[PDB]
Design an enzyme around this catalytic site. Structure first.
Site, PDB file in Angstrom:
ATOM      1  CB  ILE A 115      -0.992  -0.071   1.177  1.00 16.89           C
ATOM      2  CG1 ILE A 115      -1.785  -1.340   1.202  1.00 16.89           C
ATOM      3  CG2 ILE A 115      -1.802   1.351   0.991  1.00 16.89           C
ATOM      4  CD1 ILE A 115      -2.428  -1.635   0.059  1.00 16.89           C
ATOM      5  CD  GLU A 116       5.047   2.770  -2.327  1.00 14.87           C
ATOM      6  OE1 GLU A 116       5.601   3.517  -1.764  1.00 14.87           O
ATOM      7  OE2 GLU A 116       5.167   1.630  -2.711  1.00 14.87           O
ATOM      8  CG  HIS A 117      -1.931   5.845  -3.324  1.00 14.78           C
ATOM      9  ND1 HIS A 117      -1.455   5.128  -4.396  1.00 14.78           N
ATOM     10  CD2 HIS A 117      -3.437   5.582  -3.066  1.00 14.78           C
ATOM     11  CE1 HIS A 117      -2.698   4.304  -4.944  1.00 14.78           C
ATOM     12  NE2 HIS A 117      -3.525   4.991  -4.278  1.00 14.78           N
TER      13      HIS A 117
END
Length: 272
Positions: free
Chosen positions: A124-126
């Protein structure tokens, strides 16, 4: 050493196939990426760089027959994914469980056909935490009901991670691979591993998980920054990382680039 290596697969149409990747004998975990579309009104979709999802069924089974664990990673470096409502979290948990983590239910259908995966990776990057905690709570509940699978996470290297920090604090992840790259504040640079060692120390002491793996790029073109030659990883990082009860191994971004550089071959003493 005796080293476990996790690797991401699925980032290029032209890459070494999933089954050849498993046959190298270099990897304990192969993470397929990515489920990068979900939430906010969208149906889930995979972006695995043009590979045929149904065609992966037999390659996954072959990997598993050789004792390689295969995970599906959700989110990824880019993509229209979000999980802002409790309903999104529930819908995605149920979808992953039925279509990837359980046996065939014989009529509505499955991306990978009748393959059953070994776990889910949160890349999960954002978004913020958003509801990812509720997602993990529900998947963990499934795990406690008889479906035995792993939950892993791939946070960036600044502690605590802004997207998954709070979820990592719940201790729900079996393993975490921190990305020690694309951030000069916490990754290798100039022949100055100090930033990298200080971040590793924090992660290995504070992360509530049983296994922390160090994630490195497999080639200088694989990330914007943080590439560390394998001889330096072995000389510099291993002696210290090995005094940690939480040291799990390394993770490599990614299969396509590792094929080119032979980074894992070098880190192990030729990987046959």
């Amino acid at each position: 050493a005796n080293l476990d290596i996790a690797v991401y697969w699925g980032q290029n149409f032209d890459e070494r196939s999933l089954e050849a990747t498993c046959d190298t004998g270099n990897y304990a975990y192969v993470i397929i990426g990515f489920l990068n579309t979900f939430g906010g009104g969208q149906t889930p979709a995979l972006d695995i760089s043009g590979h045929s999802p149904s065609g992966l069924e037999p390659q996954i089974k072959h990997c598993q027959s050789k004792n390689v664990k295969v995970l599906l990673s959700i989110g990824g470096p880019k993509g229209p994914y979000s999980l802002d409502s409790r309903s999104d979290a529930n819908d995605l948990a149920v979808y992953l469980f039925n279509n990837f983590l359980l046996p065939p239910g014989h009529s509505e259908n499955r991306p990978f056909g009748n393959a059953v995966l070994d776990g889910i990776d949160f890349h999960i990057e954002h978004g913020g935490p958003s509801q990812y905690q509720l997602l993990a709570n529900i998947l963990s509940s499934f795990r406690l009901a008889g479906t035995e699978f792993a939950l892993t996470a791939a946070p960036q290297c600044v502690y605590p991670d802004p997207n998954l920090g709070t979820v990592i604090n719940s201790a729900t992840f079996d393993a975490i691979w921190v990305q020690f790259y694309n951030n000069p504040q916490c990754s290798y640079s100039s022949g100055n591993a100090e930033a990298l060692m200080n971040a590793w120390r924090e992660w290995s002491m504070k992360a509530r998980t049983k296994k922390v793996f160090l994630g490195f790029p497999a080639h200088p073109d694989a990330a914007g920054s943080g590439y560390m030659p394998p001889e330096k990883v072995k000389f510099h990082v291993f002696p210290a990382a090995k005094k940690s009860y939480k040291f799990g191994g390394i993770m490599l971004w990614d299969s396509y680039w590792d094929t080119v550089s032979n980074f894992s071959s070098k880190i192990l003493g030729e990987g046959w």
